[PDB]
Design a protein around this ligand. Sequence first.
Ligand SMILES: Nc1nnc(-c2ccc(O)cc2)s1
Length: 281
Amino acid sequence: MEMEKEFEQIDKSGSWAAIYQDIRHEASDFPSRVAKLPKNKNRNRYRDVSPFDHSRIKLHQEDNDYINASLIKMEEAQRSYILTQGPLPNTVGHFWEMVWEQKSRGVVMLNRVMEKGSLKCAQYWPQKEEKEMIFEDTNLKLTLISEDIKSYYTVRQLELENLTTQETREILHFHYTTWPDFGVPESPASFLNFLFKVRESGSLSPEHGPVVVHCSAGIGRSGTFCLADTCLLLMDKRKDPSSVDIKKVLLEMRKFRMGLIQTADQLRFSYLAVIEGAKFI
Ligand SMILES: Nc1nnc(-c2ccc(O)cc2)s1
């Protein structure tokens, strides 16, 4: 069923809350035993948001390999994403270790450091060229190279250095700065513009490790970003773009991380973004 018609049918009937609960009811349930170990309690931002054991990212160290991060592997679309939480004061070194080990080119950030008067994630990148950051626990150095500030997003060039080998890599930081404190954006136009800027960079392409995507919990806004991207790629691989079922794509993605899309308003916004983006695809 053409999703644009399914959309008007749900909207006219006001059944967004009913569709969303059906998804929550059918979603996969897999163990997260490593996330709930007592040694990991200070590695988790939210008690109710954990990575499944089968899909979790492992840090390459014998001490403790745990980070709140999942590999979402979309087989038909041929795209992979790492979804993670906003880093904590004691996990900023783990975060950059993961970026290094997984060979990521891009980091996508969909939140502000402060929202609703509370801290949603650590200040995990340098704000001035001449004041670099050193992570002593993971032996990494991070330098701000340049910054391009626009109306809806900021793009930063960073240099990450493995102090152990003196190898360096260029990381691009794509920071969407205008998602509102409550609700979802009114138009998907600036979110779609942002997504196509990330694509243009090469960050989502198979010659690199998976893109790292985060918000505060790494399931709501982060879920919207990967669902829209995968749906638009599929609408292009299929003889009948109309065969793309956004609810079936979301349940597939929920096999890899729990809770993707946190509200009925985020589900509706995801439909809007894909409907509007398809008009350019
Ligand atoms: N009426 C139409 N159905 N499909 C179209 C299409 C699909 C993929 C593209 O890359 C460009 C155009 S137009």
